[PDB]
Design a protein around this ligand. Sequence first.
Ligand SMILES: Nc1nc2c(ncn2[C@@H]2O[C@H](COP(=O)(O)OP(=O)(O)CP(=O)(O)O)[C@@H](O)[C@H]2O)c(=O)[nH]1
Ligand SMILES: [Mg+2]
Length: 214
Amino acid sequence: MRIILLGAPGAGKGTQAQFIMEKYGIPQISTGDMLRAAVKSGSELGKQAKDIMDAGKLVTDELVIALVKERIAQEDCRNGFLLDGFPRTIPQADAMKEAGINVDYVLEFDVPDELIVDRIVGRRVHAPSGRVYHVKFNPPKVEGKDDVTGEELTTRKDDQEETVRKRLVEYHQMTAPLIGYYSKEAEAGNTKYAKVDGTKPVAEVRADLEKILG
Ligand SMILES: Nc1nc2c(ncn2[C@@H]2O[C@H](COP(=O)(O)OP(=O)(O)CP(=O)(O)O)[C@@H](O)[C@H]2O)c(=O)[nH]1
Ligand SMILES: [Mg+2]
């Protein structure tokens, strides 16, 4: 089973990764994990990636696709793989096709923007220890305090509402054509495509996934 899982930043698609991995006996793979592992390994692609990253440059789509192709040839992908959060653009999807990398399902994990903003802006952290909380959905023991140390909890600057909203605007503009691309691929019989309501309780999402995936 070969699955691409797509979702907006903050939607929390990763909440279903372990369910999928355990269902099919497949690893969760990502461009970030692939790059880190390649650089650490000193492989040929890893050396190219390290030189680019060490200069503060972005790896090319061609190198990213080559890393995907290499990753899925590894023995742990014999049963398939869960490719998390990539492709991100039509050019990247077409490069997957040109390279010969088809998947069985593309799953779009949807959460409304306003709920994403709620899910994120309510987060609070204790930076010294990296413990995190949420005001409405997972309140702390003592209002505004880490129930351990009692130091004033903070909010991460990346989690500021205006930064969150800007990220979502950019994501939808980038992703709309890609969703349409995969719906077309499904119409052509090359893959299957389904949207998932990620706002539901996790067991409800899981049941919806089971109906999609058979
Ligand atoms: N912080 C940050 N994240 C970004 C940016 N652009 C895209 N992202 C993506 O947004 C996500 C932010 O993480 P988080 O707020 O935990 O979102 P999430 O949906 O719960 C994480 P997951 O997709 O694994 O379930 C990351 O997956 C990150 O790769 C950016 O400019 N800043
Ligand atoms: Mg994830």
